Amino acid sequence: HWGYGKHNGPEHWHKDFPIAKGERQSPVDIDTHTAKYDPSLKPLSVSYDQATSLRILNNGHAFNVEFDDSQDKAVLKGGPLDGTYRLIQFHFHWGSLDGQGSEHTVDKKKYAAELHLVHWNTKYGDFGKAVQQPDGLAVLGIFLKVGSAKPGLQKVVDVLDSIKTKGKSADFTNFDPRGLLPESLDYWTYPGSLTTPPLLECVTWIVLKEPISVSSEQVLKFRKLNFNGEGEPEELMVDNWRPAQPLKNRQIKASFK
């Protein structure tokens, strides 16, 4: 039922999912001036050398590139995190125009898109149990701006026509998510939630300061995807972002400056 339209978009989600008005909802605006530099924060450890991508799926809201998370192969640690978080999937949120599309904002700035690399805490055994825990997930968020192409993105862009509509999937092996990372791993971090229903308050958000650039042609291909299934009226998959939510009783920490 939920989606991103006038009638079922973010401002409606609270009726099915009451925590949408909770105390640690995401995304948020990152006020860079009031983010607290924490010299005790560690460098993020991104260990994606042995990542095994499996498949790409249009789930009707976005597309997910899924990984084999049945061993410690692509893991996130360090940073604000205790213990080890395994990559399960990544996906993006993007706009109908270059001036919008990110979920997090930085001093109210919206990026064209935002990449979420979703990881679950191995102490909880699997993703489904992890999302019921307050430290269950760690999502690495990376902003996308439009400029020069991201060559490491092109494999993803080129398979989108094979997953145009809801429920379509395609094999997607040997994709290296290191090609989606900017040079710096400087980040902001704060406790929050899934940005999509069920909006569970289980995420440590780690948002990189440095965006990656992607070309106008790459983001255009995102915008040709469909939220509908095959054989249904075409509604372009665009503006699949949730706006900034109240920060409430939270502090955003900076690993830099």
Ligand SMILES: NS(=O)(=O)c1cc(C(=O)CSc2nc3cnc4ccccc4c3[nH]2)ccc1Cl
């Ligand atoms: N936008 S986000 O917060 O990074 C984020 C997005 C998503 C998705 O939207 C993937 S599609 C997706 N469909 C479902 C259905 N039920 C779920 C129940 C619990 C948890 C996830 C669920 C889910 N995720 C999954 C995890 C995260 Cl952390």
Ligand SMILES: [Zn+2]
């Ligand atoms: Zn997301």
